[PDB]
Design a protein around this ligand. Structure first.
Ligand SMILES: [Zn+2]
Lengths: 49, 96, 169, 48, 169, 49, 345, 48
DNA sequence: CTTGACAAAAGTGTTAAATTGTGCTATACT
DNA sequence: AGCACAATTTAACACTTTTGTCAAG
């Protein structure tokens, strides 16, 4: 569940990163960030009741 | 807590107990010297070290924090006297 | 010196606030990112609230109990106990006057009871939704003359103020 | 909050109900609701 | 002259003659109808309170904003080198940014729309400092859903300056 | 006695607690297998049974 | 909701067609050049007459009385320059009117492009600064973009504007977002660091080490420097941060006070001063006086050598020998009583 | 895999995501060098 | 109690390095 | 994003005064 939440935030990050830079050539490496899912899972494991 | 080398919390219910007994100076020490009062606890420890009876405290010092906090809310807090006159609990401090 | 047998609470006038004030905090910093000293006009500033060290000013010119109460000529730090930072209060002079949210939001709203304004309409005024009429100046709206205390939205304000026009493409 | 646009209404209310991603009704809920109301359901969505 | 906001309210409150309203509400009070009577009563109660208090109603609209001493809202590093600070510091800070931004925007000659918006943000900032969360969503530190704790929250609550730190220790 | 430079920060076992030393752990930075948070040189941990 | 309020408020004022845009820009520039020509007329500065005209435009009495309690007097320095500009022939007059109209055009242009700014600020969230703050910084950047714009270049104003709004919002993150003040340079530095770290974390499949990230940063970058910048980058912690599942505890009230003397410490200092005072009294009067002149036991300051020699009328060397002797006598009596052998920490 | 609809550009390319904690044999995880456990939650089943 | 001779410590005035603050960029973009 | 330049702070450094001490009176 939390994984898919973080995945949604990552989806939004991807969506923000498309409309700028060079829409012609972009590798998925530049399009994707670790922190949304990383911090989602981190938050769930450390914090959640 | 113990880990912090802490003192025991004296609750409101315990205050009610002391009041029910009618012990004024015990409750006074609890509320001033033995808890947060700076000059009170200092002069007290001094007195016991020198073998005196501990003096009478003045300012709990959390109450002064309460006063200045109330003033931060733009509420004028005046501590008066027997005859309706200003008594400054901050001694030459915030007087300006 | 004297006993305190009485404690009162009242509204502090702006003048009283300024009287309490040792100075205004202009700059919204806390401390320098490295030196960790209070910033010039910042919230933790010593030039108003007092020194971090007892009798020691910021620059370190006047160093002792010998000098007392004398303001240092560079930092402007008063030589005194470092405890005054708990007592001495600052202030922020506001450009446009604002309302204390207590007398607004309180269950029997006080300013609303005084001026005879409902919580709703007063909420609309204070948060700048609808203008209110202090001086009508013989103005009229929809056949009925506008009087004091009356609330108008942006449209009607602009209408009775700047006039009414129609643009046709 | 936003002006009553038609396409905004379409997209929003598609994301509210008909969206399989945004709206996922439990497989157990799918099954149970299917065997309670006396009907059947294609997907996990309230509407299609 | 139709003004929107705390300025206008302040002006009305200053214009108020409490003696006029005193006599007038006293007369309004003996009206046979019960509703009008009781309403006039509560109104006259606030009015009389202001009368024998000596306090002026316009004080409820704040010009100068009192700033709490640094040691009361401390900022200090701990073991590990990392810092720590009160929420009141951040609240005060944001109030300062908005107040200064508006301060330079007024002198700028900026249009009425921007001025109005920043002024509204200023009211909500002052209120966020006084009592946070009562009006609209509580202002929280970015990335955290934990509401910032204001002066009102310092005084009241089970953990308030009274219950936790005063009536018990 | 020369007033000297550095002061003593040493870790001393809390009151009410005491025992024998079994485990010894030293993680120093600039050494393999360990990444320590910024600003911190080394962490030293002691097991006491 | 304030956001709804402002968004609707700017929703009221419509957009501007190319005609309107060009015309407004034209009228603005005409206004400015009119101000310059008026500067050649009465011989006063541009911003002077400009701010006067504004004072006649964007409000009557409200521009003067509250940009702080003190600026330029209403009946005096405003009205006299007003009346001085009033007393000119026809051309300078029509140029006065033109200037005013220019100012108004500036205002409207600002509004439509406030809609623009709202879009841009909508792009920038996540900051460490709230939405409306972003909007307002962007709006100032907008007034800025309006001022320096040139329509003669035949470019749509939107682009030039966008750059300025963006830079203004970045000025916001630099000047605002962190509780502690971190100036622009290290902000950009930290940003580059984090960005690169993300990149090579994507490449390597794991987080880097200070060495490899420093090498990836280019020349002048080592482990200590990236560690230091990262040490600056970290934010303070809220004192009200909850501790444990308990609702009765904060983080801040677990912080001790080392600034304030403990009762044991005050008593310690007291006993030290007293015992030292009594251990001093067995000395000769002069040597004791000299010692307490050296220590700061009198005025708190430190009286050197020559000063003591000047006060007692003797040479400084004598003072030196005196204090040494005193020290050793105290060595004896203290070697006896062992009252002051403590306080050695 | 990343694609372009209009271009027909196919750049597939692998990527990273993050770090995922693994459950031990006893059934507990380890977070920041501390053994922790995730308790099962009880709510009402989906459906109507 | 004294004096003169000396270097180490603490001062005092001009400079270099790095440090911080401010402004600017133009396909269009609301 | 990032650079460039002005204004500014720090640390840099070269030569001065006194402050502490040594030795011998
Ligand atoms: Zn000073």
């Amino acid at each position: 569940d939390q994984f898919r939440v973080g995945l949604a935030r990552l989806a939004r990050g991807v969506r923000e990163r498309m409309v700028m830079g060079s829409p012609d050539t972009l590798t998925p490496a530049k399009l994707v960030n670790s922190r949304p899912l990383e911090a989602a899972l981190r938050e769930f494991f450390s914090r959640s009741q | 807590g113990k880990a912090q080398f802490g003192g025991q919390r004296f609750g409101e219910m315990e205050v009610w107990a002391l009041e029910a007994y009618g012990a004024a100076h015990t409750l006074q020490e609890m509320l001033t010297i033995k808890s947060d009062d700076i000059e009170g606890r200092n002069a007290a420890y001094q007195a016991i070290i020198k073998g005196e009876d501990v003096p009478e405290p003045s300012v709990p010092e959390s109450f002064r924090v309460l006063v200045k906090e109330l003033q931060a809310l733009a509420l004028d807090v005046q501590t008066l006297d027997e005859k309706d006159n200003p008594v400054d609990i901050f001694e030459g401090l915030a007087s300006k | 010196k004297k006993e305190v047998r009485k404690v009162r609470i009242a509204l502090a006038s702006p003048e009283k606030i300024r009287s309490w004030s040792y100075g205004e905090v202009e700059k919204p910093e806390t401390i320098n990112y490295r030196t960790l000293k209070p910033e010039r006009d910042g919230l933790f500033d010593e030039r108003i609230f007092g020194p971090i060290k007892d009798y020691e000013c910021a620059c370190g010119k006047y160093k002792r109990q010998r000098f007392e109460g004398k303001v240092c000529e560079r930092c402007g730090v008063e030589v005194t106990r470092s405890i005054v930072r708990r007592y001495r209060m600052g202030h922020i002079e506001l450009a446009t006057p604002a309302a204390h949210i207590w007398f607004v939001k309180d269950v029997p709203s006080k300013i609303g009871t005084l001026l005879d304004l409902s919580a709703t309409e007063l909420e609309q005024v204070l948060y700048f939704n609808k203008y209110i009429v202090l001086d009508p100046k013989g103005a009229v709206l929809d056949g009925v003359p506008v009087e004091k205390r009356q609330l108008l939205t942006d449209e009607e304000y602009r209408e009775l103020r700047y006039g009414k026009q129609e643009t046709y493409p | 909050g936003d002006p009553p646009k038609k396409d905004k209404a379409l997209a929003y209310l598609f994301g509210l109900l008909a969206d399989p991603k945004r709206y996922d009704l439990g497989e157990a809920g799918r099954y149970k609701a299917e065997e309670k109301l006396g009907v059947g359901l294609s997907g996990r969505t309230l509407v299609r | 002259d139709a003004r929107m906001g705390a300025e206008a309210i302040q002006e009305l409150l200053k214009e108020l003659d409490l003696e006029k309203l005193e006599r007038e509400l006293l007369e309004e009070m003996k009206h046979p109808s019960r509703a009008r009577r009781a309403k006039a009563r509560k109104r006259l109660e606030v009015v009389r309170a202001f009368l024998d208090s000596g306090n002026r109603p316009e004080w409820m609209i704040l010009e100068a904003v009192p700033v709490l001493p640094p040691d009361l809202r401390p900022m200090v590093q701990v073991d590990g080198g990392r810092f720590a600070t009160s929420d009141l510091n951040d609240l005060y800070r944001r109030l300062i940014n908005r107040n200064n931004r508006l301060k330079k925007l007024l002198a700028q000659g900026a249009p009425e729309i921007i001025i109005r918006n920043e002024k509204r943000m200023l009211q909500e900032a002052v209120d966020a400092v006084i009592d946070n969360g009562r009006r609209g969503s509580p202002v929280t530190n970015p990335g955290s859903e934990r509401p910032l704790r204001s002066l009102t929250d310092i005084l009241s609550g089970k953990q308030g300056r009274f219950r936790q730190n005063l009536l018990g220790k | 006695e020369k007033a000297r430079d550095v002061k003593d920060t040493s870790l001393r076992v809390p009151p009410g607690e005491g025992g024998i030393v079994v485990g010894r752990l030293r993680l120093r930075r600039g050494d393999p297998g360990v990444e320590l948070k910024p600003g911190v040189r080394e962490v030293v941990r002691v097991f006491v049974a | 909701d304030p956001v709804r309020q402002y968004l609707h408020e700017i929703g009221q004022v419509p957009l501007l067609t190319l005609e309107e845009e060009i015309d407004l820009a034209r009228k603005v520039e005409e206004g400015m050049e009119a101000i310059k020509k008026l500067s050649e007329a009465t011989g006063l500065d541009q911003e002077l007459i400009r701010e006067v005209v504004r004072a006649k435009i964007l409000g009557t009495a409200r521009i003067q009385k509250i940009p702080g309690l003190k600026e330029k007097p209403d009946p005096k320095t405003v009205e006299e320059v007003d009346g001085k500009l009033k007393s000119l022939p026809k051309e300078l007059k029509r140029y006065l009117h033109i200037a005013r109209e220019g100012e108004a055009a500036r205002q409207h242009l600002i509004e439509a492009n406030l809609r623009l700014v709202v879009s841009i600020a909508k792009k920038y969230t996540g900051r460490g600064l709230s939405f409306l703050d972003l909007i307002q910084e962007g709006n100032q950047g907008l007034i800025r973009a309006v001022e320096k714009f040139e329509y003669k270049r035949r470019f749509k104003f939107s682009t030039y504007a966008t750059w300025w709004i963006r830079q203004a919002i970045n000025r916001a993150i630099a000047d605002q977002a962190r509780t502690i003040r971190i100036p622009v340079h290290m902000v950009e530095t930290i940003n580059k660091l984090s960005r690169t770290a993300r990149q090579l974390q994507q490449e390597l499949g794991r987080e880097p080490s200070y060495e490899e990230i420093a090498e990836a940063m280019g020349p002048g970058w080592d482990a200590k420097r990236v560690e230091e910048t990262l040490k600056i980058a970290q934010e303070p912690v809220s004192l009200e941060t909850p501790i444990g599942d308990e609702k009765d505890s904060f983080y801040g009230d677990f912080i001790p006070d080392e600034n304030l003397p403990s009762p044991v410490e005050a008593a310690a200092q007291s006993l030290l001063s007293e015992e030292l005072e009594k251990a001093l009294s067995k000395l000769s009067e002069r040597e004791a006086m000299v010692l307490k002149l050296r220590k700061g036991l009198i005025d708190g300051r430190e009286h050197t050598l020559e000063e003591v020699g000047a006060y007692f009328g003797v040479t400084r060397e004598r003072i030196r020998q005196i204090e040494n002797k005193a020290l050793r006598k105290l060595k004896y009596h203290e070697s006896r009583t062992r009252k002051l052998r403590d306080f050695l920490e | 895999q990343l694609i372009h609809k209009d271009t027909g550009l196919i750049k597939e390319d692998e990527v990273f995501l993050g770090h995922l904690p693994l459950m031990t044999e006893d059934g507990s995880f380890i977070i920041n060098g501390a053994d922790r456990v995730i308790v099962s939650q009880i709510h009402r089943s989906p459906g109507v």
